[PDB]
Design the sequence.
């Protein structure tokens, strides 16, 4: 062939922390269909937002927004337990269909995005340059988001484990641990990567008895 | 009501 | 400058499933130091293996091995709870130091890798070509590893939640759910991505009562 | 005793 | 747009020495039209061959051949004097038209190459890898071809200038110069880049009187 | 090796028309030595300027200037006849030496450029982006320079051939041809690529008798 | 009868 | 006195 139609920019979704997670890489040949499985961030969460993005930046708000929809009716479950399968499907016509299916509830919602959507060529090449210029800033934002989500998961798990421990956990431990979850939860509200790790570290340091009781539980 | 979580 | 020393290949570690996780990207200028935080895969796991790799393939066994060491003395904890911080540090001399520090125990182990280690230029360019040729196979392996780890996490969480539920969970639910965990645990032992998702899906479908009881618990 | 887990 | 049609490989023509000269670069967006002006290699040459190639190698025989045609009826002229304009034109349908027009004679010949011609995707990516692997060998072949064509031009010009000099050139000079053109013409028939430069150098060294007489002529 | 020193930008020289001609490509591993042979643009030219540049733009004035020197004492010769060999040599210390040797006169001049010269990293990545953004403008400038130099060569050759023809060329031909060389020489002083080709074309159209007489001469 | 010459 | 000519 003298010609290929390829994706000039990556296509994906915004995930927790405001990051673009790619489903279809830049320069993938049409037609194509990719899927990935995602979950909820909170206990009892009943819907997820699917924000569809085009571009090469690690920050979602720095990419082009192609549209957004929600899938609701997610049944009550602990966070990270629902299986929401997101499929990006680009047909031979260059039309993108993005669906999300809850594998428990069977419920599905879809957005369809015309082949003329998104960034025009001047913007496309502006985007490839901006991604290139900014590899450092975006790497730093990617690592901060990944620390913050780890801190959140640690925040959430340790609270659950305090719960299932109840009386097994000595008075002094619970006080040290709860003090740490409060400062951790504070730190999570800033942009200081070292401060979040310092609060996560304090928590690892005071939670050793809890960790044993939780390991022993199961 | 929240973006998806990369699991 | 007329000259830069840059990393000719990515440098990283093997993570769960046999995948290379990069800490220092290809073409990063020396000197440089990057860190990322990782955890255990099993309840009560007392050590982690740090296998250091050079190259651009998503499969660890397809990259160059620069060495390997363990950090032990990890105190008993539920999986995913210990914070093992891995730092890749390349000094002005092109020497790589890779340390792992347990933030709870304070324990640290290190390997130091001379600037002459790893792949020579012919191999370097053979590696960039092989990565390039194989983007599809590696993407497929990356998605299979990510499904398998999700299935494992779901396997493990649902068992824990069966536990903390005990009598709250009706007889019929526990039987349907345990049948599913057995087939899920079977599927995890193959290489069939669809079969693992089908078993994870069966589990989402029978666990709805459990998910409510677990959500209600906390 | 196992590779690290990307968390 | 979510999609661009771009050229997956460079498109061009074979020029003197067996090298690919590109008219449309890899990754140029359709539709597009580029032109370049080329000439004859011999005095009194009455036709040129337009051999159309697809790919990224500097050697013509290493690229994909899309077809070939001749433009004849070139009127008698010293080499390098006819203006043969070669236009590569790819329309919105991904069809390539390549025409050559003699600007003197007004004569034009064309080949049309369907959008399905050339290398299929597996071959396309095999080609990008082979180009990449072989940058050195191809650079070396490119420099050898460029030396050989310089040697040929020097061979040809010095003969012409011997002619227009006639008696102005001393007996001893003509003998030294003609001996050198014979060895130069020999060397041009091998693949030894240094040997051609050594014979071109010998010629520069003995032709100083001729060069003055030629400079003085005009 | 964990590390390579490679050239972060191409290194080259300014050639006729203000274009950068590369001798050492971007991403070439140190140490390395490349040579290319160049010539004069005018009859009786006695020196050439070697302007050394760093960067990826096709326009010389858009690249970083690393320095400049002249080689003189070029003996009288028709343009394009002297062989000036330019060698770029970067040693293990990242020092660049650029010499020019006249192969006739044996004369050589050199500039030496310290490893700390040229653009710093912020500028380096600004340069890779600017080259990338500007592929079109630079391609257009490259084709204009190549037309202009062809027009100049045609200007110069046709004048020489008018000379060596003298009486063989009919009165009417010489008048038509000289009128065309005047307009060609005018057009060469603008930036209008089509206008130069139109004047070169007019000249091809009126010079057919001259071309025959010149072909017949040798 | 010969490839073109890059001029 | 003039840049070199790519020959």
Sequence:
């Amino acid at each position: 062939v003298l010609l290929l139609d390829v994706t000039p920019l990556s296509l994906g979704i915004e995930t927790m922390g405001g990051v673009m997670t790619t489903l279809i890489a830049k320069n993938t040949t049409i037609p194509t269909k990719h899927s990935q499985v995602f979950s909820t961030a909170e206990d009892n969460q009943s819907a997820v937002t699917i924000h569809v993005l085009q571009g090469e930046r690690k920050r979602a708000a720095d990419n082009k927004s192609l549209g957004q929809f929600n899938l609701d009716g997610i049944n009550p479950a602990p966070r990270g337990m629902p299986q929401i399968e997101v499929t990006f499907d680009i047909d031979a016509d260059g039309i993108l269909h993005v669906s999300a299916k809850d594998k428990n509830s069977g419920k599905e919602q879809k957005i369809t995005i015309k082949a003329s959507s998104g960034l025009n060529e001047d913007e496309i090449q502006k985007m490839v340059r901006d991604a290139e210029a900014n590899a450092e800033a975006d790497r730093k934002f990617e690592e901060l988001v990944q620390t913050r989500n780890q801190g959140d998961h640690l925040l959430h798990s340790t609270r659950k484990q305090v719960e299932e421990a109840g009386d097994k956990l000595p008075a002094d431990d619970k006080t040290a641990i709860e003090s740490a979850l409060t400062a951790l939860e504070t730190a999570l509200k800033g942009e200081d990567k070292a401060a979040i790790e310092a609060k996560m570290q304090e928590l690892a340091q005071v939670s050793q008895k809890l960790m044993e009781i939780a390991q022993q539980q199961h | 009501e929240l973006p998806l979580v990369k699991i």
